[PDB]
């Protein structure tokens, strides 16, 4: 298909994890940083 899947990546470790003892963060952009949500086939695998 000549495509490539983006993984869970972000420009800051502060926004990559939320403070709720559970799932990770999901905010898209904060000021000039970014956080790309997982679009790979490994969505429910590869534990964090």
């Amino acid at each position: 298909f000549q495509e490539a899947y983006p993984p869970l990546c972000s420009s800051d470790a502060a926004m990559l994890r939320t403070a709720h003892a559970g799932e990770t963060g999901a905010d898209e952009v904060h000021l000039a940083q970014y956080l790309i949500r997982d679009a790979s086939p490994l969505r429910g695998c590869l534990p964090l």
Binding site: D12, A13, A14, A19
Partner: protein, 49 residues
């Protein structure tokens, strides 16, 4: 075996961030949490602090 750090201060200014604005407010004009930590708090066998 259990391992905890004590005097570790986050050197980069990027990691000294707060999740909200007024999370821990104090009457003092200088917030006594920007100072580098000198101790660690953990729980006992009986749940004592």
């Amino acid at each position: 075996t259990f391992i905890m750090p004590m005097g570790v201060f986050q050197a980069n200014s990027m990691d000294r961030y707060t999740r909200h604005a007024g999370d821990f407010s104090t009457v003092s004009e200088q917030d006594p949490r920007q100072f580098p930590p000198q101790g660690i708090f953990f729980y006992n066998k009986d749940g004592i602090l």
